[PDB]
Amino acid sequence: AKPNPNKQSVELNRTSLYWGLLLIFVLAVLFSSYIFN
Amino acid sequence: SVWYGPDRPKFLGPFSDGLVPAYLTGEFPGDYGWDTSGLSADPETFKKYRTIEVIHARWAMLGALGCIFPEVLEKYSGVQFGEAVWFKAGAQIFADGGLNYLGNSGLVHAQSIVATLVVQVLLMGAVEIYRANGEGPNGFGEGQDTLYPGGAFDPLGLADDPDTLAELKVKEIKNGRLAMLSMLGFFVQAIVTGKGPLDNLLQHLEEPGEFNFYALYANSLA
Amino acid sequence: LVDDRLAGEGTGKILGINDPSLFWAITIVFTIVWGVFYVSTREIDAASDRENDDDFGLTL
Amino acid sequence: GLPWYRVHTVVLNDPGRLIAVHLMHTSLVSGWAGSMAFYELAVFDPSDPV
Amino acid sequence: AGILGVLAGLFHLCVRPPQRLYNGLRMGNIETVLSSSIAAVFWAAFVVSG
Amino acid sequence: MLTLKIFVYTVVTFFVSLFIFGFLSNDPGRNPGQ
Amino acid sequence: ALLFFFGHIWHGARTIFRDVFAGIDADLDEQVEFGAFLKLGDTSTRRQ
Amino acid sequence: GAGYRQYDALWLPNTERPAWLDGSLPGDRGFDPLGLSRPAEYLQIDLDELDQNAAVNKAGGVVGAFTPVADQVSTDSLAPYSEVFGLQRFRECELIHGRWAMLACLGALVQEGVTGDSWVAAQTLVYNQPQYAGIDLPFDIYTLAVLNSVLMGXVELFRNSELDPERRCYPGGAFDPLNLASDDSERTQKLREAEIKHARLAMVSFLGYTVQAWYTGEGALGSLNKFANGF
Amino acid sequence: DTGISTPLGTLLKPLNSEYGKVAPGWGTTVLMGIFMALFAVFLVIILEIYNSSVLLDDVTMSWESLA
Ligand code: CLA
Ligand code: CLA
Ligand code: CLA
Ligand SMILES: CCCCCCCCCCCCCCCCCC(=O)OC[C@H](CO[C@@H]1O[C@H](CO)[C@H](O)[C@H](O)[C@H]1O)OC(=O)CCCCCCCCCCCCCCCCC
Ligand SMILES: CC1=C[C@H](O)CC(C)(C)[C@H]1/C=C/C(C)=C/C=C/C(C)=C/C=C/C=C(C)/C=C/C=C(C)/C=C/C1=C(C)C[C@H](O)CC1(C)C
Ligand SMILES: CC1=C(/C=C/C(C)=C/C=C/C(C)=C/C=C/C=C(C)/C=C/C=C(C)/C=C/C2=C(C)CCCC2(C)C)C(C)(C)CCC1
């Protein structure tokens, strides 16, 4: 009916982007070394 | 409308203008102007004859459907009655297994002819006394028409409009007259051919120009 | 034989009916649909605000 | 705006969309069950159960 | 357990919660339901693992 | 196999009867014409 | 099971402490004064 | 005026009738130690604030005291009565329970006498092979199960359609063909008292039946025989 | 802006009508505590049965009980 009153917009700044990229790549390093066996 | 008044259809087509009596004015369903013998000149006898005709029509419709149903259900189905022909289905009460409904040994399993006759006498006498008196138990059905009651006999309410009621009356009387003629046909065919009504139809459809009354039984009837 | 089958191919049956059960299915379904359609024809015709006399229908 | 770890809180006070997201989760779980069963059937060898 | 569950479901359908318990457990919130359900499921996970 | 034939016959006749009795139900009057 | 124990703890803390999810009140010094009230956090028992 | 004592009688020789039981109902003996029919009082709690756009979201407070009115039937089909804890609804439940218990007691006794099987084993025997008085029925157990569910559902949906709380217990009409207690007089009140007493007695008797079978493993006639052949 | 009407929603409406209705006071907390205590005792009993901290005559508590 009427527009949903629970509308929100997500956000992510450059610091969060850098932290996420670093976490992804470090986890990839460690567990790729362990998964290739 | 189409079926009432002076412009209604008549039973001789264009030749029926000079044969319609003065008392068949087109007031009741099924009025086609056929009173050549003048047996309904008296209004009281006319009313009694109308009641008799409608009751006969209803009974004949039920009888035709019930005479043709178990024979159809025995050939084009998996049901196995003790006897499917209508004029031979009364002797099942003397069989070893009794009368089994739909061929099932645990549906009715009637064994005594006298008990069924007594129960039928009681029930039919009660209902026909109620109908003739026009007054059921505890004053049930008082003030209703003795031929078209309605109310408890019309649960679906298909006759709540007078025009629809008149049209349905015409339909009922025409179907009933056709059923009466068909039941007379059933009786005479059973007497002459000796086989079921469906057997005659299927044998005729096998070869219509060869299996009919004239080619088989006409010359042996004198 | 080794197994069982309907064995009806290339026979020439009327409407493919090798069974009264099939005949009854066809007839019952057709009659039900026709009966449902029959009672609504008076109402459907009245939606055009015209009587179903000899001049009824889409004409040109 | 909302942080990335608070996105699903929009349906906290929305019963209809709460039902919707629960239905989506159930659909995903059933799909996983069916797909896993098919994958295991494609690679199973029932020749020797001993 | 099924019989007891039916009986307890009828009880909880018929009887309203106490005011003190309502205020203490925040029965007007749905996150309390979430927390209790999470507790129950991790209890069940420990049991099935053992 | 006969049960499957009966079921398919029922379905087919149902849909074909729907088609016929829908096209018989005053179809050339459902147009936006004046 | 272990991860869901953490989840239970987090969500219970969030549902009980819901009014202070964005932060504590601006002036919260009288209630957190040692020996100001007989009962902890109760402003109707100011003594001792 | 001799051979007895002249002597309202309650459930105790010296006790007082509760305020909510005024003695107008048929079987009213002033018996309610737990006060289940006492008019309940409730409270209304305001809606919790769950807005994500607000700084402070406090819980809900008490709006005010709230005592509802019960024994009112509406067109809900899923909660017709105004409240669960009402005297009229409890009376209807008691009457339905009692009628079912009377039928159950009489039927268990008659079936045990006629067939010779215990009323507990009769269920399994009929499940394995449907029968009645030694006559095998022409129906399958699956068809019987579906038919029983459908017929009972239809009957109870018909019964639920009533809206008058008085006629929900005593419909009359087609259910009183002989017109025995269909008016407002002293004769109907005595019949209602007898009905409620029989209902209570049959309820207690069937609770008996069930516990006795649980403990001794016998039915009703079986329990009688086991008790008789134990002296 | 009442909402969207629906036959099923109207059928199920009375089941979602009493939001904040509560029983005044402590209500039935003591009965629920009694049930909780009984549940705790039952859980302790079954845990000790599995743990072999309690030994029963007819309970084998082994793979051999499948015989
Ligand atoms: C590890 C510590 C721990 C902590 C700090 C919490 C903390 C909390 N719990 Mg959780 N919880 C835990 C473990 C824990 N829980 C466990 C193991 C379970 C069982 C699944 C639960 C199940 C649970 C429920 C069902 C609920 C909470 C809720 C809550 C909140 C407050 C209510 C509370 O105090 O419950 C009391 C918690 C206790 C652990 C204390 C009881 C102490 C026990 C009974 C010891 C008795 C000793 C024992 C019988 C001795 C013999 C045993 C021997 C034979 C082995 C809060 C977030 C409540 C809530 O508000 O959620 C929003 C609520 O609804 N919890
Ligand atoms: C109401 C409609 C009616 C219908 C549709 C049928 C149908 C059938 N009849 Mg029956 N019949 C009826 C009434 C009816 N009959 C009546 C009232 C009687 C008593 C006189 C008979 C006596 C009867 C006999 C003695 C025989 C049949 C047989 C037959 C078959 C046709 C072959 C034949 O020689 O017919 C000839 C029909 C009659 C002697 C009289 C019919 C008079 C009615 C009023 C005519 C209905 C008109 C018709 C549908 C269309 C016009 C065709 C025709 C008049 C030119 C056919 C299955 C035959 C059969 O079983 O062979 C396998 C056969 O042996 N019928
Ligand atoms: C039972 C199911 C369950 C449910 C319905 C919720 C529901 C919620 N959680 Mg809780 N939570 C749970 C269990 C659950 N939680 C558990 C087990 C933990 C411990 C790990 C937590 C810890 C937790 C935290 C720390 C937070 C929440 C918050 C929230 C809210 C927002 C979540 C969010 O938007 O994520 C959006 C998520 C992402 C964009 C991506 C996450 C992807 C993860 C890292 C891995 C990928 C997952 C994989 C595909 C599927 C998992 C498999 C399955 C077996 C788990 C929401 C009310 C948030 C909050 O409270 O809001 C105010 C928040 O901060 N939860
Ligand atoms: C004739 C009245 C028409 C009224 C209006 C009809 C409207 C139709 C709407 C569209 C329907 C299309 C789908 C139909 C599906 C059901 C049929 C089907 O699959 O049957 C498939 C079945 C197959 O039957 C098979 O039979 C075998 C033994 O022979 C075995 O028994 C098999 O098990 C069985 O399946 O065939 C039939 O039923 C035969 C149908 C014969 C129809 C004759 C029509 C005569 C009158 C029309 C003449 C012109 C027809 C067109 C010619 C030119 C075409 C370019
Ligand atoms: C109109 C007119 C006019 C002018 O003026 C004059 C004149 C001419 C005289 C007139 C005419 C008339 C006529 C035609 C008549 C007819 C009639 C009929 C036919 C009837 C039948 C009628 C008929 C009928 C009822 C019938 C019925 C039947 C029945 C019930 C049946 C039953 C049954 C069944 C189910 C089955 C089983 O298994 C068997 C039985 C048991 C058997
Ligand atoms: C539309 C439709 C349809 C279809 C459907 C379908 C086809 C579906 C599918 C579905 C599916 C097919 C689904 C799936 C899903 C899946 C999932 C959901 C998964 C998940 C996973 C995960 C989550 C994982 C995780 C992990 C990893 C990665 C590693 C290790 C660790 C873990 C385990 C954590 C049909 C026609 C039928 C009907 C109608 C409608």
Side-chain angles (χ1 to χ4, degrees):
Chain A
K2 57 198 199 76
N4 216 167
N6 320 103
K7 197 235 154 223
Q8 308 268 1
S9 70
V10 81
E11 95 155 22
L12 191 100
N13 46 7
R14 215 182 304 185
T15 291
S16 316
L17 163 78
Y18 286 141
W19 267 125
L21 285 170
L22 197 62
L23 166 69
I24 290 312
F25 266 78
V26 167
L27 284 184
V29 164
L30 190 64
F31 281 106
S32 85
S33 166
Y34 268 97
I35 271 159
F36 269 133
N37 236 25
Chain B
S1 62
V2 197
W3 311 103
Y4 296 96
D7 295 317
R8 75 210 183 280
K10 266 131 211 151
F11 91 107
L12 265 204
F15 302 108
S16 47
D17 289 323
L19 250 194
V20 173
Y23 45 89
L24 293 193
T25 79
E27 200 199 352
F28 305 108
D31 206 299
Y32 275 90
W34 188 13
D35 202 34
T36 66
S37 289
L39 302 172
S40 283
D42 208 8
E44 178 77 15
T45 318
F46 189 24
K47 161 197 267 310
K48 298 276 194 46
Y49 281 170
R50 287 192 322 255
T51 306
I52 293 180
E53 177 191 41
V54 177
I55 295 299
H56 270 78
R58 292 161 176 166
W59 275 109
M61 287 189 266
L62 275 178
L65 182 48
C67 279
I68 214 55
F69 194 84
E71 192 161 3
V72 163
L73 218 69
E74 207 220 24
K75 218 214 198 143
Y76 308 123
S77 208
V79 196
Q80 248 160 49
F81 312 92
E83 192 54 55
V85 198
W86 74 267
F87 59 86
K88 281 190 316 223
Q92 297 170 107
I93 213 83
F94 306 121
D96 282 1
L99 195 134
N100 295 316
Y101 198 79
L102 278 163
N104 215 268
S105 301
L107 269 194
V108 159
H109 208 44
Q111 308 260 331
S112 180
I113 174 66
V114 179
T116 74
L117 185 46
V118 166
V119 171
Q120 174 195 341
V121 161
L122 280 174
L123 295 175
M124 286 305 302
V127 296
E128 293 273 286
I129 282 179
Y130 299 151
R131 164 175 82 81
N133 203 17
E135 238 277 343
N138 261 337
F140 165 67
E142 184 47 314
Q144 282 167 347
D145 208 358
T146 36
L147 200 47
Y148 304 101
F153 299 96
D154 200 6
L156 263 45
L158 313 180
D160 286 0
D161 224 303
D163 293 1
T164 323
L165 178 51
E167 269 248 14
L168 290 162
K169 284 177 176 181
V170 169
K171 301 214 213 195
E172 170 185 65
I173 203 55
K174 291 176 83 172
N175 280 263
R177 290 173 183 165
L178 173 74
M180 289 194 258
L181 198 80
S182 312
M183 280 299 314
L184 173 59
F186 279 9
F187 294 154
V188 184
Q189 289 185 17
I191 282 176
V192 168
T193 88
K195 299 195 207 23
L198 191 66
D199 257 9
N200 303 138
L201 174 66
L202 298 175
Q203 205 210 355
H204 183 68
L205 283 189
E206 202 206 314
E207 193 54 48
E210 184 158 73
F211 303 128
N212 44 340
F213 165 63
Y214 302 92
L216 301 168
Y217 313 104
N219 39 274
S220 53
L221 257 45
Chain C
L1 287 325
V2 195
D3 54 11
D4 221 43
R5 54 187 79 238
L6 278 199
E9 281 189 23
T11 300
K13 297 159 184 172
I14 291 179
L15 280 161
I17 293 172
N18 73 316
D19 227 67
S21 42
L22 313 160
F23 181 87
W24 288 130
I26 297 184
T27 307
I28 285 172
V29 181
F30 181 86
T31 317
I32 287 183
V33 179
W34 165 81
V36 174
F37 149 84
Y38 185 83
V39 315
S40 319
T41 29
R42 179 65 29 141
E43 149 161 353
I44 279 166
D45 253 337
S48 34
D49 295 323
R50 300 234 284 101
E51 208 222 323
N52 214 328
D53 61 321
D54 297 324
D55 314 342
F56 200 75
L58 209 66
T59 5
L60 176 60
Chain D
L2 261 191
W4 69 266
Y5 49 85
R6 293 188 198 176
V7 276
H8 296 171
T9 50
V10 291
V11 302
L12 193 125
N13 214 20
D14 227 2
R17 309 217 146 153
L18 196 75
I19 297 169
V21 299
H22 287 173
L23 271 152
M24 194 40 78
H25 187 270
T26 317
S27 163
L28 292 161
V29 178
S30 325
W32 174 88
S35 311
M36 197 72 231
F38 272 141
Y39 171 84
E40 291 193 355
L41 278 171
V43 315
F44 184 51
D45 177 73
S47 303
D48 190 0
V50 182
Chain E
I3 296 175
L4 190 44
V6 170
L7 294 185
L10 299 167
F11 171 84
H12 279 290
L13 271 165
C14 294
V15 189
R16 302 301 306 173
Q19 166 202 8
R20 304 296 286 262
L21 272 204
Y22 195 98
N23 289 333
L25 284 175
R26 318 296 208 284
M27 267 146 173
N29 216 324
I30 198 155
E31 220 150 6
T32 173
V33 185
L34 184 46
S35 153
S36 324
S37 311
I38 290 178
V41 301
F42 90 72
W43 174 286
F46 268 127
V47 161
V48 299
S49 319
Chain F
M1 276 328 193
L2 190 59
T3 306
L4 187 59
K5 188 174 183 172
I6 294 176
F7 182 58
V8 167
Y9 267 53
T10 300
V11 167
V12 171
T13 188
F14 172 69
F15 279 115
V16 172
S17 318
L18 276 184
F19 173 88
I20 291 171
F21 288 117
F23 260 128
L24 271 168
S25 296
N26 197 20
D27 201 323
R30 315 179 183 267
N31 56 76
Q34 304 295 330
Chain G
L2 226 53
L3 293 169
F4 271 68
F5 160 71
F6 176 77
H8 154 65
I9 279 301
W10 161 261
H11 280 299
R14 211 183 91 79
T15 178
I16 290 190
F17 297 76
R18 177 61 184 262
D19 40 321
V20 280
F21 185 60
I24 73 175
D25 283 0
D27 281 337
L28 200 68
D29 285 324
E30 187 63 42
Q31 281 92 334
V32 203
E33 185 68 30
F34 284 88
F37 307 136
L38 281 189
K39 203 194 171 192
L40 195 49
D42 203 4
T43 60
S44 49
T45 63
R46 182 189 276 103
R47 209 39 59 93
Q48 160 220 283
Chain H
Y4 68 111
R5 187 185 186 89
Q6 177 50 50
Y7 258 156
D8 43 351
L10 302 190
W11 68 290
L12 278 175
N14 173 239
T15 195
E16 70 221 284
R17 219 182 268 259
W20 52 99
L21 298 180
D22 57 333
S24 48
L25 283 196
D28 201 314
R29 284 310 119 77
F31 172 70
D32 204 2
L34 298 198
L36 298 182
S37 287
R38 194 165 37 211
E41 292 161 323
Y42 298 118
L43 288 166
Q44 186 63 60
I45 307 283
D46 222 333
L47 266 86
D48 259 18
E49 309 175 10
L50 301 168
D51 206 9
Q52 215 181 5
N53 304 315
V56 202
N57 286 331
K58 260 159 159 83
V62 171
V63 161
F66 157 57
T67 157
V69 52
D71 314 334
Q72 319 247 317
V73 198
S74 41
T75 45
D76 280 327
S77 303
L78 249 73
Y81 272 98
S82 174
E83 216 218 322
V84 173
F85 286 87
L87 195 48
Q88 224 74 43
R89 198 192 93 86
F90 285 157
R91 172 57 102 222
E92 177 182 349
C93 292
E94 182 181 32
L95 262 183
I96 300 298
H97 278 75
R99 292 164 176 166
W100 281 115
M102 292 195 257
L103 273 191
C105 286
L106 179 65
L109 259 187
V110 169
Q111 174 260 291
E112 215 149 351
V114 161
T115 321
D117 297 321
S118 164
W119 67 270
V120 198
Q123 321 166 262
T124 310
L125 271 281
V126 174
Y127 186 76
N128 280 348
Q129 171 90 66
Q131 48 188 340
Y132 186 90
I135 308 161
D136 290 0
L137 299 198
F139 299 110
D140 192 19
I141 194 55
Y142 203 115
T143 324
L144 285 177
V146 182
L147 272 165
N148 288 26
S149 308
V150 166
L151 295 180
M152 283 318 292
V155 165
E156 296 273 296
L157 278 162
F158 277 142
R159 172 170 82 79
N160 196 30
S161 66
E162 239 297 331
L163 281 192
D164 195 36
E166 159 99 336
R167 319 265 308 310
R168 282 188 74 97
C169 308
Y170 311 104
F175 298 104
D176 204 25
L178 275 69
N179 212 303
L180 278 183
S182 287
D183 50 52
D184 192 277
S185 48
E186 188 224 50
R187 172 185 308 320
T188 88
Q189 251 56 56
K190 286 186 45 213
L191 283 176
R192 294 179 179 194
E193 295 247 8
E195 185 187 35
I196 209 55
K197 284 195 222 192
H198 281 86
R200 291 157 180 181
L201 173 67
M203 279 195 258
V204 172
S205 311
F206 204 79
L207 171 58
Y209 284 18
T210 318
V211 170
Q212 245 160 84
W214 277 338
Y215 184 75
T216 62
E218 313 275 341
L221 298 179
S223 293
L224 275 173
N225 295 296
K226 187 178 184 173
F227 180 68
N229 307 313
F231 278 105
Chain I
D1 283 323
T2 66
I4 292 182
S5 213
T6 278
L8 194 53
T10 318
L11 190 58
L12 299 171
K13 192 46 195 159
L15 299 180
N16 202 35
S17 59
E18 326 157 301
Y19 175 78
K21 211 171 86 165
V22 302
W26 279 105
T28 47
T29 314
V30 177
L31 199 59
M32 158 204 117
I34 293 176
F35 281 114
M36 275 183 96
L38 283 177
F39 197 39
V41 174
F42 164 71
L43 286 184
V44 153
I45 289 182
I46 58 158
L47 161 77
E48 292 215 8
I49 283 182
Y50 208 158
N51 189 250
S52 278
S53 273
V54 85
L55 306 170
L56 309 180
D57 322 67
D58 37 355
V59 183
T60 310
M61 237 294 305
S62 175
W63 286 107
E64 328 263 14
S65 40
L66 278 168

